[PDB]
Coordinates of C-alpha atoms in Angstrom, one line a residue:
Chain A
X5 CA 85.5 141.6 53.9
X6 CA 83.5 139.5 56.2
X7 CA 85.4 137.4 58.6
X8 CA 84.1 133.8 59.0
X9 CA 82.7 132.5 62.3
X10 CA 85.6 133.4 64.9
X11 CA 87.8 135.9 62.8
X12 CA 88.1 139.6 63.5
X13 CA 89.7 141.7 60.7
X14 CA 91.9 144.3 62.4
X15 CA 93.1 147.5 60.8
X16 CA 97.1 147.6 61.5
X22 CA 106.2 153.1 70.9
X23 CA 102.5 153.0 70.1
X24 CA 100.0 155.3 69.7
X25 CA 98.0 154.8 72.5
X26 CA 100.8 155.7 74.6
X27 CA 101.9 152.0 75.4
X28 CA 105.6 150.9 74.6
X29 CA 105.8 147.0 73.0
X30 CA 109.0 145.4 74.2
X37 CA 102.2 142.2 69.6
X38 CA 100.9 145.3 67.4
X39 CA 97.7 147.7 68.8
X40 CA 95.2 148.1 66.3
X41 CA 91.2 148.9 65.3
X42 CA 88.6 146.2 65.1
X43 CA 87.1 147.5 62.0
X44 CA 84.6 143.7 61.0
X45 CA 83.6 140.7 64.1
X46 CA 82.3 137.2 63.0
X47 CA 79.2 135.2 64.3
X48 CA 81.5 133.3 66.6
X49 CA 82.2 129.4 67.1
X50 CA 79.3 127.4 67.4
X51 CA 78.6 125.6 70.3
X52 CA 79.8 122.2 69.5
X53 CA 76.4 120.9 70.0
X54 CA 75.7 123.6 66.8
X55 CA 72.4 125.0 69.0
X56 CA 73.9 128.7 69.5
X57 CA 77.1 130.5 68.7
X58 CA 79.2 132.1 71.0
X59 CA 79.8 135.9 70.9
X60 CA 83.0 137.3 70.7
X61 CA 83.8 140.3 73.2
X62 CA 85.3 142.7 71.0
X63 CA 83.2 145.0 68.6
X64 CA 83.9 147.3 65.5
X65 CA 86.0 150.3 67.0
X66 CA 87.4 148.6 69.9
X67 CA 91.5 149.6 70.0
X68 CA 92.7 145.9 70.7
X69 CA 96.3 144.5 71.3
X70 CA 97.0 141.1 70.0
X71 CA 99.7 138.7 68.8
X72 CA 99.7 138.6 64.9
X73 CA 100.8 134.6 65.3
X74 CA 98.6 132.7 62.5
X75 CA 97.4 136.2 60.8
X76 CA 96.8 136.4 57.7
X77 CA 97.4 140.3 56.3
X78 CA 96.3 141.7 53.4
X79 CA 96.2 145.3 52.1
X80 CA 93.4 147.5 50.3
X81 CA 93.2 150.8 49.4
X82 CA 96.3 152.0 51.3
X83 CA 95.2 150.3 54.5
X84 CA 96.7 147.1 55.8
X85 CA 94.5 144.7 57.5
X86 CA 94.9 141.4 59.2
X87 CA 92.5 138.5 59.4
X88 CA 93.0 137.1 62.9
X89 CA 91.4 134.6 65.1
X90 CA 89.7 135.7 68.6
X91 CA 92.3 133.8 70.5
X92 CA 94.9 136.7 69.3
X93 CA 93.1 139.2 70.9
X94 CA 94.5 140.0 74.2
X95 CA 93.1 143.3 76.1
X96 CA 91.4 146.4 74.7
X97 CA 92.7 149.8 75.5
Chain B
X5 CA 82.1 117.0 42.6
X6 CA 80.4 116.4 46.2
X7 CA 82.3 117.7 48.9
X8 CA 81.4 115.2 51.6
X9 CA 80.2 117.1 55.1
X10 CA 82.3 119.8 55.9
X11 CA 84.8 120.2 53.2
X12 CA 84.3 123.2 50.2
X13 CA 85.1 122.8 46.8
X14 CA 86.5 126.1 45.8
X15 CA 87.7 127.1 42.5
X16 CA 91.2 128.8 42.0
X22 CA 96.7 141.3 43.5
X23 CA 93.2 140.2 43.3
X24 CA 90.4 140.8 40.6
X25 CA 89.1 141.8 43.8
X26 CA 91.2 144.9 44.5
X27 CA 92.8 143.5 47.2
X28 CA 96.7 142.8 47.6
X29 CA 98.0 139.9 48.9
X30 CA 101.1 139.7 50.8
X37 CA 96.4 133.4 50.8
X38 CA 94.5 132.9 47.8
X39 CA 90.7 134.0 46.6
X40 CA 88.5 131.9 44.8
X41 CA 84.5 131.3 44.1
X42 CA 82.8 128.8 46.7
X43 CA 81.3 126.1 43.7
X44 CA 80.4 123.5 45.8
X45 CA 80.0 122.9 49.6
X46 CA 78.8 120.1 51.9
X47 CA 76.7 119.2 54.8
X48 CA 79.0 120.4 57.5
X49 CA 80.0 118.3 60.9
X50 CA 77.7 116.0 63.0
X51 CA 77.2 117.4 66.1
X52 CA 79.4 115.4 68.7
X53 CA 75.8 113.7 69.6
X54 CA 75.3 113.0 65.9
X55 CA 71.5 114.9 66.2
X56 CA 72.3 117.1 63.7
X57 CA 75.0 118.5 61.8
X58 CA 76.4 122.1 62.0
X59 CA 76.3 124.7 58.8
X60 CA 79.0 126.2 57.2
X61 CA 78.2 130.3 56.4
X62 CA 80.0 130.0 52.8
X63 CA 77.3 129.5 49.8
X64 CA 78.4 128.6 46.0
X65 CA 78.8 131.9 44.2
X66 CA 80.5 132.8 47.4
X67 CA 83.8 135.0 46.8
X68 CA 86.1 134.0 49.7
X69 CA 89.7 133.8 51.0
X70 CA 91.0 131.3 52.3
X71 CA 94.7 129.7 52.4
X72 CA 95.6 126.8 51.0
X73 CA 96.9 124.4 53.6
X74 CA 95.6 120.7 53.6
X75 CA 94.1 121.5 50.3
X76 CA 93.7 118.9 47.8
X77 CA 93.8 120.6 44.0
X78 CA 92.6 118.6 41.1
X79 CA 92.0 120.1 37.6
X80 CA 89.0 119.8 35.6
X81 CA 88.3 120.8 32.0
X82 CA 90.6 123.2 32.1
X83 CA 89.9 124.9 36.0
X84 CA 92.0 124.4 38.9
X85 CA 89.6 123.3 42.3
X86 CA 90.6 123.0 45.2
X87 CA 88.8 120.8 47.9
X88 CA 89.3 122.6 51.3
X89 CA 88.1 122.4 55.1
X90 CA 85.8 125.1 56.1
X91 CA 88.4 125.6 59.0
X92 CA 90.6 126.9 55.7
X93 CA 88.4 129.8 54.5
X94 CA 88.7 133.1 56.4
X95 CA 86.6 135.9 54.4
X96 CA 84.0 136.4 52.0
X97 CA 83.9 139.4 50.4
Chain C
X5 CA 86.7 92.5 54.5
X6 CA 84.0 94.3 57.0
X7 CA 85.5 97.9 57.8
X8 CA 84.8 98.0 61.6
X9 CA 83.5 101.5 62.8
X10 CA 84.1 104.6 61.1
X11 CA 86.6 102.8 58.3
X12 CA 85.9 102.5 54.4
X13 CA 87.2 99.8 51.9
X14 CA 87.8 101.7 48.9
X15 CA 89.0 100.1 46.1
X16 CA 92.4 101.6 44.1
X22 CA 94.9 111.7 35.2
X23 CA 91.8 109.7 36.2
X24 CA 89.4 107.5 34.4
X25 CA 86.5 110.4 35.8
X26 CA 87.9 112.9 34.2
X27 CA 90.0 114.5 36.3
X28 CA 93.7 115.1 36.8
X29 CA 95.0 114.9 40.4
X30 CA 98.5 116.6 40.9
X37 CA 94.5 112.3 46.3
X38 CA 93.8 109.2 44.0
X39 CA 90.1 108.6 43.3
X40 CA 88.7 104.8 43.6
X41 CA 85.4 103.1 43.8
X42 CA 83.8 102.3 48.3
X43 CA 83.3 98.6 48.0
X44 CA 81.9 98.4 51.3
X45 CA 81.4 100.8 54.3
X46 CA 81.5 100.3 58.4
X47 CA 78.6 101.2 61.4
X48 CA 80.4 104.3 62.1
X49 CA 81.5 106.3 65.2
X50 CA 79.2 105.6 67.9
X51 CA 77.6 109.3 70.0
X52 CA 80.2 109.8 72.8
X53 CA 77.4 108.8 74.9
X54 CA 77.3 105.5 73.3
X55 CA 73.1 105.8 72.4
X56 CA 73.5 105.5 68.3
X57 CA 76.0 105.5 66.0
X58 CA 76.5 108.4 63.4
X59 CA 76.6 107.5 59.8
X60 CA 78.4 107.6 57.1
X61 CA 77.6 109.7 54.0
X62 CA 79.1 107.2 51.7
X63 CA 77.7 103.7 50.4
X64 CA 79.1 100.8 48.7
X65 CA 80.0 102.0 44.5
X66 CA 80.2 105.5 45.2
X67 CA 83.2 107.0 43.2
X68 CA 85.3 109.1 46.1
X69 CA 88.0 111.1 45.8
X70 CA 90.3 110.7 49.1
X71 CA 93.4 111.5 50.3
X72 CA 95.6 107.6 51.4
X73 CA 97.1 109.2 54.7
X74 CA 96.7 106.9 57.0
X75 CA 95.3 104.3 54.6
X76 CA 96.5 100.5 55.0
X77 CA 97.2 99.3 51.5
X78 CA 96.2 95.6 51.1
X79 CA 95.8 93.4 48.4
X80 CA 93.7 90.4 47.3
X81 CA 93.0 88.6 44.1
X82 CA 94.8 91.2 42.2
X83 CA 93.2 94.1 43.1
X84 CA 94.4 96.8 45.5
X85 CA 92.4 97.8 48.1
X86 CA 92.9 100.6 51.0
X87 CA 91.3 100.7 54.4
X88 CA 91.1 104.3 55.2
X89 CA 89.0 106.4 57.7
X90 CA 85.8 108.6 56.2
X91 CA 87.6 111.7 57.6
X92 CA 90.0 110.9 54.2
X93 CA 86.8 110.5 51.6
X94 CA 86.6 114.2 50.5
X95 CA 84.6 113.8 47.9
X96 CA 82.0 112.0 45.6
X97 CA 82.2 112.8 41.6
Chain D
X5 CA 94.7 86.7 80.1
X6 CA 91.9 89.1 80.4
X7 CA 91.9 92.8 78.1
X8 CA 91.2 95.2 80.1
X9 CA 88.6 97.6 79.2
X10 CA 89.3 98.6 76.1
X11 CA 92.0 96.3 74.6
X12 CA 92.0 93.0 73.3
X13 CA 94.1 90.1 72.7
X14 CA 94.8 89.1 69.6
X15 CA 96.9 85.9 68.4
X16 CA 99.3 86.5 66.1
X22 CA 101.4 86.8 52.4
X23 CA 98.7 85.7 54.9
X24 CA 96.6 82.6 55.9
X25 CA 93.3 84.2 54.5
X26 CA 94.1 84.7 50.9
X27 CA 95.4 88.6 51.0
X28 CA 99.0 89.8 50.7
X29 CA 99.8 92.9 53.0
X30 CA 102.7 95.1 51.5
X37 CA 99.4 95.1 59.0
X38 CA 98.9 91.7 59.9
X39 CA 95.5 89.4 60.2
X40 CA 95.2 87.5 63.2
X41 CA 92.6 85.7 65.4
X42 CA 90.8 87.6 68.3
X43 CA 91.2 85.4 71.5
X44 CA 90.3 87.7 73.6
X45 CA 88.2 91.1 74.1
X46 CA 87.7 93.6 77.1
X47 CA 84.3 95.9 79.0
X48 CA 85.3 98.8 76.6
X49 CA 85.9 102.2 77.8
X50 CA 83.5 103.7 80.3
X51 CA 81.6 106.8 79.1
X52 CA 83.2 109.5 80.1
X53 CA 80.4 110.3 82.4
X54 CA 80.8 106.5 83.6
X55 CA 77.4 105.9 83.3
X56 CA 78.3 102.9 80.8
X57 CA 80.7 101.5 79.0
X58 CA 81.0 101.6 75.3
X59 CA 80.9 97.5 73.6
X60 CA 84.0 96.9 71.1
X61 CA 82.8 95.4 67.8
X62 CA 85.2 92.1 67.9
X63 CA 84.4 89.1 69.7
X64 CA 86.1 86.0 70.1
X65 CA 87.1 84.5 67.3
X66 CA 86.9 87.3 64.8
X67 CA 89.6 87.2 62.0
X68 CA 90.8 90.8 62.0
X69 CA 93.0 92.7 60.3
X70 CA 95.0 95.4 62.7
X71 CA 97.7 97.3 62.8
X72 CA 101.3 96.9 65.3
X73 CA 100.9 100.3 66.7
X74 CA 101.6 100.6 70.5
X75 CA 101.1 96.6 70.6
X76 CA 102.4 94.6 73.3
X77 CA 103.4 91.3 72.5
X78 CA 103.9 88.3 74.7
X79 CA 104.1 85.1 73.7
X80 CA 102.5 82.0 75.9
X81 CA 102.9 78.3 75.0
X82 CA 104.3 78.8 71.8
X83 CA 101.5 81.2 70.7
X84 CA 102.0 84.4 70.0
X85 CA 100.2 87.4 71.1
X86 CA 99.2 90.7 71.3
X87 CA 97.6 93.0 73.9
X88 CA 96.8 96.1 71.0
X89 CA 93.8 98.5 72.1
X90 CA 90.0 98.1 69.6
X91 CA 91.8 101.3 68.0
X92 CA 93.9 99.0 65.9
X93 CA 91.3 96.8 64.7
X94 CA 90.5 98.0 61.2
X95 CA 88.2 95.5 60.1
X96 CA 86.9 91.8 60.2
X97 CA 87.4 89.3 57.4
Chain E
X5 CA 101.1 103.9 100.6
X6 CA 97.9 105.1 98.9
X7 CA 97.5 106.0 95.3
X8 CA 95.9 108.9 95.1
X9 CA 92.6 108.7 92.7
X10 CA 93.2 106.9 89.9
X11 CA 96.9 105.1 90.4
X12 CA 97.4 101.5 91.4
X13 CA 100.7 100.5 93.8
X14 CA 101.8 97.0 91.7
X15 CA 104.4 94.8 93.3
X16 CA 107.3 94.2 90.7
X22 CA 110.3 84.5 81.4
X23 CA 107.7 85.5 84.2
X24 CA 106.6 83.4 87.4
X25 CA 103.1 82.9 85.5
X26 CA 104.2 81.3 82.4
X27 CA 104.1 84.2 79.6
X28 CA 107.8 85.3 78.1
X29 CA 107.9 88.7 77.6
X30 CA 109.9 90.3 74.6
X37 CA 106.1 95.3 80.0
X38 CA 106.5 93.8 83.5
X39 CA 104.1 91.5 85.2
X40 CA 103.1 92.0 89.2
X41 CA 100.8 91.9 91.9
X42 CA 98.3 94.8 92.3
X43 CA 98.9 95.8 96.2
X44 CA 97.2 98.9 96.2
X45 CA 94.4 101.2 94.4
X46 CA 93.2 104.2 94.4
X47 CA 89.4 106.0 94.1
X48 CA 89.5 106.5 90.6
X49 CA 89.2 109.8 88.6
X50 CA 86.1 111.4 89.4
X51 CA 83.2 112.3 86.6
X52 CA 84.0 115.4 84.6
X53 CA 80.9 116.8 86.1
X54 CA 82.4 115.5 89.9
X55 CA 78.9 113.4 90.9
X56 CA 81.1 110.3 91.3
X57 CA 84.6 108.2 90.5
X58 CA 84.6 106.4 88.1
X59 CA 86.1 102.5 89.4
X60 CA 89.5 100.9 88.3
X61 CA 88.9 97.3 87.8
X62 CA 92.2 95.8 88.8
X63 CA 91.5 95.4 92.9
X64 CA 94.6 94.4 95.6
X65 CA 96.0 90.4 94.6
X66 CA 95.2 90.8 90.9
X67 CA 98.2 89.5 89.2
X68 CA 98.1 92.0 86.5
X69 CA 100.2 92.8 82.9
X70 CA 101.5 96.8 82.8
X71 CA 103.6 98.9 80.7
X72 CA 106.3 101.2 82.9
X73 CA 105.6 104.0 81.2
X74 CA 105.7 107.1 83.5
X75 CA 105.3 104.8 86.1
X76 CA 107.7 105.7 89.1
X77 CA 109.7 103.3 91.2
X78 CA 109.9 103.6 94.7
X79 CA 111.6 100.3 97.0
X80 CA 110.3 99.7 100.3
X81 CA 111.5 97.1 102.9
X82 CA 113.5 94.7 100.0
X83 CA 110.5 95.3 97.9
X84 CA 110.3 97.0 94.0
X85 CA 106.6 98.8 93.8
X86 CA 105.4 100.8 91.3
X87 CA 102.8 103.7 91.1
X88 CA 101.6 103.3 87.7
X89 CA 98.1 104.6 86.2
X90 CA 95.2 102.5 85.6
X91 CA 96.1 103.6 81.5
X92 CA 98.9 101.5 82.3
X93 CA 97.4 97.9 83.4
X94 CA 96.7 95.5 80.2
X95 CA 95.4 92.6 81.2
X96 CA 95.1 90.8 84.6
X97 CA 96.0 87.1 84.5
Chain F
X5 CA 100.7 131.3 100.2
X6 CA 97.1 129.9 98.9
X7 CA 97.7 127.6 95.8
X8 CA 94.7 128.8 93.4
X9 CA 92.4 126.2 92.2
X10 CA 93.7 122.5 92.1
X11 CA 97.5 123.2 93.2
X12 CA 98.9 122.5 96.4
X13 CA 101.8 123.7 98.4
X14 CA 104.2 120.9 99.5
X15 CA 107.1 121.4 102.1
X16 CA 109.9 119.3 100.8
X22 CA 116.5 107.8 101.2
X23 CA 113.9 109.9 102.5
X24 CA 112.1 110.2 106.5
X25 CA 109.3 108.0 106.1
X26 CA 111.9 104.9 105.3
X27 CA 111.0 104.6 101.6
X28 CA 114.0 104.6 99.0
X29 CA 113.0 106.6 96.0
X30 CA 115.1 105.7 92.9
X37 CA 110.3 111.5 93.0
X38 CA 110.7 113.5 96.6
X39 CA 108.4 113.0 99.4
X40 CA 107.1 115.9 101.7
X41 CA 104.1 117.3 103.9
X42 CA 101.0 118.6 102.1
X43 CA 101.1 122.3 104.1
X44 CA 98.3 124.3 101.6
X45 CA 95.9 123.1 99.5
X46 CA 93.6 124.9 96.8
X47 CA 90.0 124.6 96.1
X48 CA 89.9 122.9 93.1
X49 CA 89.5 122.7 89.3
X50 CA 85.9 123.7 88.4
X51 CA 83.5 121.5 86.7
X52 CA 83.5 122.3 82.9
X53 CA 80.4 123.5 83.6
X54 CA 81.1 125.7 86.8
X55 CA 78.8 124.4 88.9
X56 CA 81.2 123.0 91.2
X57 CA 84.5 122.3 91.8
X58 CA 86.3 119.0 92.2
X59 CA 87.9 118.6 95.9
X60 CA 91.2 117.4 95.8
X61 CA 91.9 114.0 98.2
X62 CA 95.0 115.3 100.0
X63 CA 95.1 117.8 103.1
X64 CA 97.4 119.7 104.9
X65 CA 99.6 117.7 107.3
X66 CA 99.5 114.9 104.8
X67 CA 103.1 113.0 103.7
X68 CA 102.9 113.0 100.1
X69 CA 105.0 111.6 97.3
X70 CA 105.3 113.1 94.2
X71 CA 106.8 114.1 90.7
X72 CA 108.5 117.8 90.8
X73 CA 107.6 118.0 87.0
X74 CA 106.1 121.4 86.1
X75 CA 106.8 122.3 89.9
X76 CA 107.5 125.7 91.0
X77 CA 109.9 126.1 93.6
X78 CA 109.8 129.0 96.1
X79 CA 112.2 129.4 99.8
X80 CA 110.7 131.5 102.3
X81 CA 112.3 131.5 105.9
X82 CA 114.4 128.8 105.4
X83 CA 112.3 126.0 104.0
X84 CA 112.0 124.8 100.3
X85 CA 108.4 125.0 99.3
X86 CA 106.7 123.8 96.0
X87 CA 103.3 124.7 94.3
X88 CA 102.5 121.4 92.4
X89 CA 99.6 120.9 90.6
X90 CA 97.5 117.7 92.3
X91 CA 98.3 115.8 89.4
X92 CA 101.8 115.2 90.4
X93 CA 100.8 114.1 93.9
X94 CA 101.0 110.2 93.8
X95 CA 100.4 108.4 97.2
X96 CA 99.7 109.6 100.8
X97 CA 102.0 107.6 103.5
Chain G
X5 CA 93.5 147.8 79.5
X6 CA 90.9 145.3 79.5
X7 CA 92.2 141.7 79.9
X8 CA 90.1 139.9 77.0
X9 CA 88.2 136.9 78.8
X10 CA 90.6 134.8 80.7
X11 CA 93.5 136.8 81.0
X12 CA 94.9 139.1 83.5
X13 CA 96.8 142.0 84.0
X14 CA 99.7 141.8 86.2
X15 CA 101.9 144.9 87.3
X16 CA 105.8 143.1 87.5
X22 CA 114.4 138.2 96.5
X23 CA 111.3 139.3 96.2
X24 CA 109.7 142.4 98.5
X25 CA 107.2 140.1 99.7
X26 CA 110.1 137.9 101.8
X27 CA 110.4 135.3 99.6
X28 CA 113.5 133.7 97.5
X29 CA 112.2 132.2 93.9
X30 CA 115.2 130.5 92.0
X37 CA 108.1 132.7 88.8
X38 CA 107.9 136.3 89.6
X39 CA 105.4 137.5 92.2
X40 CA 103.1 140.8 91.4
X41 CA 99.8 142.9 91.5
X42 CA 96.5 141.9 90.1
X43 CA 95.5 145.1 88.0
X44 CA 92.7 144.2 86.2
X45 CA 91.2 140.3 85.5
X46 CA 88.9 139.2 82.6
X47 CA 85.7 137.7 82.1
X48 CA 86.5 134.2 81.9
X49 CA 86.1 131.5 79.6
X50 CA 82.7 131.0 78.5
X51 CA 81.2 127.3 79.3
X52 CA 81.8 124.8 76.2
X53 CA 78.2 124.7 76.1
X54 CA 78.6 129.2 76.1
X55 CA 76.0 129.5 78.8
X56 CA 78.4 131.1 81.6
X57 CA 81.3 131.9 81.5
X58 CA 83.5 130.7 84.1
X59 CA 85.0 133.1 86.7
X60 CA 88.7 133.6 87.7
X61 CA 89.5 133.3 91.2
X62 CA 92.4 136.6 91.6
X63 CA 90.5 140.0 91.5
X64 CA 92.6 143.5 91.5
X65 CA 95.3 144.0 94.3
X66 CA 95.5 140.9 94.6
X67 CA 99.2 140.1 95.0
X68 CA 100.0 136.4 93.0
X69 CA 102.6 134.6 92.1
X70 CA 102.8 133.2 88.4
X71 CA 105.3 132.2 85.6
X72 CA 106.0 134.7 82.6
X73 CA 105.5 131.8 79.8
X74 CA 103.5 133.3 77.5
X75 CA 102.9 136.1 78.7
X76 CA 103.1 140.0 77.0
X77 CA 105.3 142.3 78.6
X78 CA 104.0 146.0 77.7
X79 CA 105.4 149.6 79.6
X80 CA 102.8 151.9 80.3
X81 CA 103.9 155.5 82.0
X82 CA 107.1 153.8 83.6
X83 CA 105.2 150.9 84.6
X84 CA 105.7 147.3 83.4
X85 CA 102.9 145.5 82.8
X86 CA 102.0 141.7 81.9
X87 CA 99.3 140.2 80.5
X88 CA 99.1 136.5 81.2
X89 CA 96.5 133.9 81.1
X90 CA 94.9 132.7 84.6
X91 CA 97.1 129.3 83.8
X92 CA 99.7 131.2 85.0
X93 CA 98.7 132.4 88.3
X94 CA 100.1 130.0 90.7
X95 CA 99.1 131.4 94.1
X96 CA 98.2 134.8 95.9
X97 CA 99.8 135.7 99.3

């Protein structure tokens, strides 16, 4: 699973030691990025495979394999990494 | 069936091995992509025919022919390949 | 009828052979197009007059004359060539 | 009664030959256009005086001056010239 | 009173001759204009003070001064100037 | 208090001899401005401290400190200068 | 807790000596910024840590770390430092 320009696919009291009063998670596969809208260069997004990210799962699309449970989400859902 | 510049015509658990909680489908036709706002040149899509994506179905337009079920979907619609 | 800018006159299971659960019709005639946002050219459309398109009539002003039916509506709504 | 930049002023089964299940009318008026958004120049509308065009009601303001009718509706109306 | 970039003070059957089924005034006041995206310069309203113009009161906010009805209303606002 | 980039802190018939139908006050702070898209520069707002302002409370952001009724509205609320 | 580019992390009468009828806190950590359109630059936020602001809670994500409450909300948000 390769996310399309933009996407990140995320591997779903947390435990990082943070409390939630938004899910935590692994960046496990990055797109290429938006294009510029003048289509010269694309623009890098600022999270990489491994990163521990918290983000919003508004607009996410989750899907399971293999006993893990993964979410396709866009960049703007990605809030901080830990 | 000629998807005109930036629209995909894709064709309709997964065969995959993937559970879905969103469909998947085989990228059979794709177009041009977008003008650039300047109209220079236009932007390309990263999905190919033979292409195994997912994508949801939203704003999809699904005609039947001989027997398959299309769909004709914005680029903005598909998430994966895998 | 001269579509202004951007606009295409498209004239109203399908006599293609296809069935649409988006009619499909017959461009009789096709405008300039959006001009750059810096007003330099124009960007054109990828349509011409005869093309079959399949389109979607959101949006689409319905008018007829002679006794044909005829629809106005903007190229972002021609999804298609067959 | 001068349009300004953008807008134009057009005077109100129809008088051409086509039935509109929208309304045709006579442009008596047009305005600059609307300046680039780097105000460098101003973008020319594709009406002029006398056009027949066919437009839409939309956000039209209507005034009515020695028992003429008409209407101040911005070039986005104008769909296309007859 | 000085609209600040961008707003015009206007003055509020009509004393011109037009019946109106939007007010009709006297433009007593302008502003600099909104400046370019990129700030170099403002771009310039083309209504100027005594211009007997055509507005909608849209957002526009009353104020009376001295037995007079004014108006700050944006430039989007002014139609036509008679 | 130092309004970040493009607000400004106002001190709120009314003093000036205006009747407002939309409050009136005394530009005390002022911020430095909304950056060009670009970020080359920013875009100096046209009001200064000590200036009698009217303006829309819409999206304001009331705060007392002391004894006086302060609000941090955005520029695009301020109006006119007096 | 890195603040993905554009957003900041906020530690939550108000001990400052002011009354807000908007919470005020403690720039912890600030983003990148947004990156330029054009994805040349990205553009910088004008609070850096300590500094104490004053911004609204819409949008924002509450999240408790080790007894203390945390926020992270975009830089639209931050109103003002003091």
């Amino acid at each position: 699973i390769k996310p399309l320009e933009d996407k990140i696919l995320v591997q779903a009291t947390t435990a990082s030691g943070l409390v939630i009063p938004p899910q935590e998670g692994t960046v496990v596969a990055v797109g290429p990025g938006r294009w510029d809208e003048d289509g010269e260069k694309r623009i890098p997004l600022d999270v990489a495979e491994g990163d521990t990210v918290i983000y919003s799962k508004y607009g996410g699309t989750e899907i399971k394999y293999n006993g893990e449970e993964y979410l396709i989400l866009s960049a703007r859902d990605v809030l901080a990494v830990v």
